[PDB]
Short mmCIF file of all heavy atoms in Angstrom, two decimals:
data_model
loop_
_atom_site.label_atom_id
_atom_site.label_comp_id
_atom_site.label_asym_id
_atom_site.label_seq_id
_atom_site.Cartn_x
_atom_site.Cartn_y
_atom_site.Cartn_z
N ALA V 27 4.32 -31.70 -20.21
CA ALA V 27 4.04 -31.62 -21.68
C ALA V 27 3.50 -30.34 -22.25
O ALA V 27 3.59 -30.06 -23.45
CB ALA V 27 3.01 -32.75 -22.02
N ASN V 28 3.15 -29.42 -21.31
CA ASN V 28 2.81 -28.00 -21.65
C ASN V 28 4.09 -27.08 -21.82
O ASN V 28 3.84 -26.02 -22.40
CB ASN V 28 1.96 -27.32 -20.58
CG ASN V 28 2.45 -27.32 -19.27
OD1 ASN V 28 2.91 -28.33 -18.74
ND2 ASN V 28 2.31 -26.24 -18.48
N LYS V 29 5.18 -27.44 -21.36
CA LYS V 29 6.25 -26.54 -21.31
C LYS V 29 7.23 -26.93 -22.47
O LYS V 29 8.37 -27.34 -22.28
CB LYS V 29 7.10 -26.62 -20.09
CG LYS V 29 6.26 -26.27 -18.87
CD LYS V 29 6.10 -24.80 -18.74
CE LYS V 29 5.10 -24.57 -17.52
NZ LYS V 29 5.90 -24.52 -16.26
N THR V 30 6.76 -26.78 -23.69
CA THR V 30 7.63 -27.14 -24.95
C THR V 30 8.56 -25.92 -25.37
O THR V 30 8.52 -24.91 -24.67
CB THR V 30 6.78 -27.54 -26.00
OG1 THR V 30 6.10 -26.43 -26.56
CG2 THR V 30 5.68 -28.53 -25.68
N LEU V 31 9.33 -26.22 -26.39
CA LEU V 31 10.27 -25.38 -27.00
C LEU V 31 9.61 -24.71 -28.16
O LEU V 31 10.27 -23.91 -28.76
CB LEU V 31 11.53 -26.04 -27.25
CG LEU V 31 12.17 -26.66 -26.11
CD1 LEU V 31 13.72 -27.03 -26.37
CD2 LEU V 31 12.24 -25.95 -24.62
N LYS V 32 8.39 -24.91 -28.42
CA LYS V 32 7.65 -24.20 -29.51
C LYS V 32 7.45 -22.72 -29.25
O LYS V 32 7.27 -22.37 -28.04
CB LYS V 32 6.36 -24.80 -29.91
CG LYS V 32 6.55 -26.22 -30.36
CD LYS V 32 5.97 -26.29 -31.81
CE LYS V 32 4.59 -25.80 -32.20
NZ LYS V 32 4.27 -26.21 -33.52
N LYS V 33 7.54 -21.89 -30.30
CA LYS V 33 7.61 -20.47 -30.14
C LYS V 33 6.35 -20.00 -29.36
O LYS V 33 6.39 -19.22 -28.31
CB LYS V 33 7.62 -19.83 -31.48
CG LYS V 33 7.68 -18.35 -31.56
CD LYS V 33 7.64 -17.91 -33.00
CE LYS V 33 6.75 -16.61 -33.08
NZ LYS V 33 7.59 -15.47 -32.73
N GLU V 34 5.13 -20.43 -29.76
CA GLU V 34 3.90 -20.01 -29.10
C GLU V 34 3.97 -20.34 -27.52
O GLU V 34 3.35 -19.48 -26.68
CB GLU V 34 2.69 -20.61 -29.61
CG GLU V 34 1.41 -20.56 -28.77
CD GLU V 34 0.14 -20.59 -29.67
OE1 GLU V 34 0.25 -21.44 -30.62
OE2 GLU V 34 -0.85 -19.92 -29.37
N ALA V 35 4.48 -21.58 -27.20
CA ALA V 35 4.59 -22.01 -25.84
C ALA V 35 5.58 -21.05 -25.07
O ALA V 35 5.21 -20.47 -24.03
CB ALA V 35 5.06 -23.41 -25.74
N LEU V 36 6.72 -20.88 -25.65
CA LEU V 36 7.64 -19.97 -24.98
C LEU V 36 7.18 -18.57 -24.73
O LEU V 36 7.25 -18.03 -23.52
CB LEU V 36 9.04 -19.98 -25.75
CG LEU V 36 9.78 -21.25 -25.98
CD1 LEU V 36 10.77 -21.10 -27.05
CD2 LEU V 36 10.42 -21.81 -24.66
N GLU V 37 6.48 -18.02 -25.79
CA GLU V 37 5.88 -16.73 -25.53
C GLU V 37 4.82 -16.75 -24.39
O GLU V 37 4.68 -15.71 -23.64
CB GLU V 37 5.16 -16.30 -26.76
CG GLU V 37 6.17 -16.12 -27.94
CD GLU V 37 5.60 -15.63 -29.22
OE1 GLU V 37 4.35 -15.72 -29.34
OE2 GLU V 37 6.37 -15.34 -30.11
N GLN V 38 4.01 -17.82 -24.23
CA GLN V 38 2.95 -17.91 -23.11
C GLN V 38 3.56 -17.66 -21.64
O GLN V 38 3.02 -17.05 -20.87
CB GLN V 38 2.15 -19.14 -23.04
CG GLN V 38 1.29 -19.40 -24.21
CD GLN V 38 0.23 -20.38 -23.95
OE1 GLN V 38 0.36 -21.43 -23.16
NE2 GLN V 38 -0.93 -20.12 -24.58
N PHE V 39 4.84 -18.16 -21.46
CA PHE V 39 5.56 -18.04 -20.24
C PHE V 39 6.70 -17.04 -20.21
O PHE V 39 7.58 -17.19 -19.29
CB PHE V 39 6.13 -19.43 -19.78
CG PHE V 39 5.05 -20.53 -19.94
CD1 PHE V 39 5.20 -21.49 -20.96
CD2 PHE V 39 4.06 -20.54 -19.12
CE1 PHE V 39 4.19 -22.37 -21.03
CE2 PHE V 39 2.99 -21.56 -19.28
CZ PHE V 39 3.14 -22.57 -20.23
#
Side-chain angles (χ1 to χ4, degrees):
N28 53 321
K29 304 277 177 92
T30 74
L31 308 193
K32 297 244 308 189
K33 184 183 141 87
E34 168 157 38
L36 303 160
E37 296 182 347
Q38 293 204 325
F39 319 103

